[PDB]
């Protein structure tokens, strides 16, 4: 949920306050965000800049930046969401998905990808070699 010692954002922020003001310019927001590996769109940038004081000429302080980064970090998909996404395709309710079922899902749904890639990720889902994929167990194993 909440942030913890990810206040290292400040470091990135501090690399971009020209003055000691601790204030970055609106024009730089995207840049600083890309310094943290985030790729905001122009719509998101405008929405964030309008939330921050519009009157002030390119004045964003680190409190406002951290408040925006809080939502940006809290919008990452959770473990239970991934489990629900798995359950969407197992209407059997058994807790398992056939390897061919997942293959058909990945070939004829979602973003398109090469067949060798679907083979590799089916191998990753099919641990034992059997048609079953224990999605609950697998996602719990992956989430430490």
């Amino acid at each position: 949920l909440t942030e913890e010692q990810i206040a290292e954002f400040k470091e990135a922020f501090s690399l971009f306050d020209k003055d000691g003001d601790g204030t970055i310019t609106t024009k730089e927001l995207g840049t600083v965000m890309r310094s943290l590996g985030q790729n905001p769109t122009e719509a998101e940038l405008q929405d964030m800049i309008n939330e921050v004081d519009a009157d002030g000429n390119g004045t964003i302080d680190f409190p406002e930046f951290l408040t925006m980064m809080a939502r940006k970090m809290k919008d990452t998909d959770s473990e239970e969401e991934i489990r629900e996404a798995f359950r969407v395709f197992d209407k059997d309710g058994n807790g398992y998905i056939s390897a061919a079922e997942l293959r058909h899902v990945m070939t004829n749904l979602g973003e398109k990808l090469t067949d060798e890639e679907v083979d590799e990720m089916i191998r990753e889902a099919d641990i034992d070699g059997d048609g079953q994929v224990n999605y609950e167990e697998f996602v719990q194993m992956m989430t430490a």
């Binding site: 690399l15 890309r34 310094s35 590996g37 969407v88 979602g110 989430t143």
Partner: protein, 425 residues
């Protein structure tokens, strides 16, 4: 909210798991990491959790903090260059002599190729595979992309030409990692080994003797910086500005601090000061790629890369097929050799003419029977040569290890299959 969205989350999760396996291998089987306090425990079960990925993010944060504290106050020109590099996208280049692309480009890692061949035994592990264990990653050189010059701007990585065919992608991988040099070799060579040395020699001065320097973290030498895909650009830019501040050549400084710096110039600078290396976990298979043939390849390089297209183009006469089969046996490419043996019908007089080949390295140095018996990989072709009566089993070598027979090479390689075959025949 659509079903496509859930399938997308599923496949993103599985790609994350593949990357987690790769990074767990790297961080648990890497001996150099333990000395640097960056090592990680082995996976408890059959697979590894996302803890390898969080460990990757942690070591990336560590190196970012190390380089940020080195220069916490930033000047205007420094921050302008940092913004230029933060907003610039990369092209990633993999060079090989093999044909890795048809309608789709599929590049696999070393470990994936090993697992696919399913050879029974594991040969002695090389030092790199042991010290870094990055062998489940496809490797790439890095160039700037916002240019309209010829696509392969740089053709050498660690002054090595890894192949004539250059495959270039233009998108970052979400789970790749960047190093400022090779993950094995943390040293940049002198200027006489750099490809684009002419530009820097003509226009810049003291950087020539300043550029060849170990690029390492504050822990000391052999501390190779690791950056994840999210933090790579910042780390590159900060290490670059550290080097630029250390440099005394004002011309180089104001060239790399030109507000309207040229993208190709920036690529020249980053290929000069650093030798960036990008790693994508396990495989790389996409439809968005560019293939450039930089040069023609030799028949032997083609045999080594199993490039059947160049082989068929170059091997048209039996005199050339002699060279091809010699290079196949010498380089232990048995499948290529069997392809040649089916496409061209070889007789005993052909092997006699191969024995007289002084142009070819293997056949001028070694007896053909020696070449057949050197390694177990050639068993099949050995079988072909013996069942078809092309060579006599008891023939005594006359070139290298004279007086020995093929049984002796079999006993050296300790391959019981070859020994039984030679004994019964």
């Amino acid at each position: 909210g659509r079903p496509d969205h859930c399938a997308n989350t599923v496949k993103n999760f599985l790609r994350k798991s593949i990357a987690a396996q790769s990074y767990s291998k790297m961080f648990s089987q890497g001996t150099s990491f333990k000395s640097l306090n960056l090592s990680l425990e082995a996976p408890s079960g059959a697979r590894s959790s996302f803890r390898s990925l969080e460990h990757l993010d942690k070591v990336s944060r560590h190196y970012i903090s190390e380089i940020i504290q080195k220069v916490h106050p930033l000047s205007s020109d420094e921050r302008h260059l940092l913004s230029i590099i933060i907003n610039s996208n990369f092209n990633f280049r993999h060079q090989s002599n093999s044909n890795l692309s048809n309608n789709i480009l599929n590049i696999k890692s070393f470990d994936k190729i090993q697992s696919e061949n399913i050879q029974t035994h594991k040969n002695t592990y090389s030092e790199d595979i042991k010290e870094i264990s990055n062998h489940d990653f496809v490797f790439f050189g890095v160039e700037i992309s916002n240019h309209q010059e010829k696509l392969p701007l740089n053709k050498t990585h660690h002054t090595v030409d890894f192949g004539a065919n250059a495959y270039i992608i233009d998108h970052d991988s979400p789970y790749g990692y960047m190093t400022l040099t090779d993950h094995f070799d943390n040293a940049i060579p002198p200027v006489f080994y750099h490809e684009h040395q002419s530009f820097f020699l003509d226009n810049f001065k003291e950087v020539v003797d300043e550029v060849s320097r170990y690029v390492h973290g504050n822990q000391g030498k052999t501390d190779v910086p690791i950056f994840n895909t999210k933090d790579m650009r910042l780390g590159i830019g900060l290490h670059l500005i550290d080097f630029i501040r250390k440099s005394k050549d004002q011309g180089f400084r104001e060239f790399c601090y030109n507000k309207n710096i040229d993208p190709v110039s920036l690529d020249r600078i980053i290929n000069f000061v650093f030798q960036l290396e990008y790693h994508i976990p396990r495989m790389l298979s996409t439809d968005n790629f560019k293939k450039i043939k930089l040069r023609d390849i030799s028949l032997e390089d083609a045999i080594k890369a199993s490039n059947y297209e160049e082989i068929n183009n170059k091997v048209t006469d039996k005199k050339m097929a002699h060279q091809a089969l010699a290079y196949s046996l010498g380089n232990k490419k048995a499948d290529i050799a069997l392809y040649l043996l089916s496409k061209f019908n070889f007789t005993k007089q052909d092997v006699a003419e191969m024995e007289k080949m002084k142009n070819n390295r293997y056949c001028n140095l070694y007896d053909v029977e020696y070449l057949l018996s050197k390694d177990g990989a050639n068993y099949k072709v050995l079988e072909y040569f013996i069942n078809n009566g092309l060579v006599d089993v008891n023939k005594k070598f006359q070139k290298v290890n004279s007086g020995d027979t093929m049984l002796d090479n079999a006993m050296k390689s300790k391959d019981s299959k070859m020994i039984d075959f030679l004994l019964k025949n």
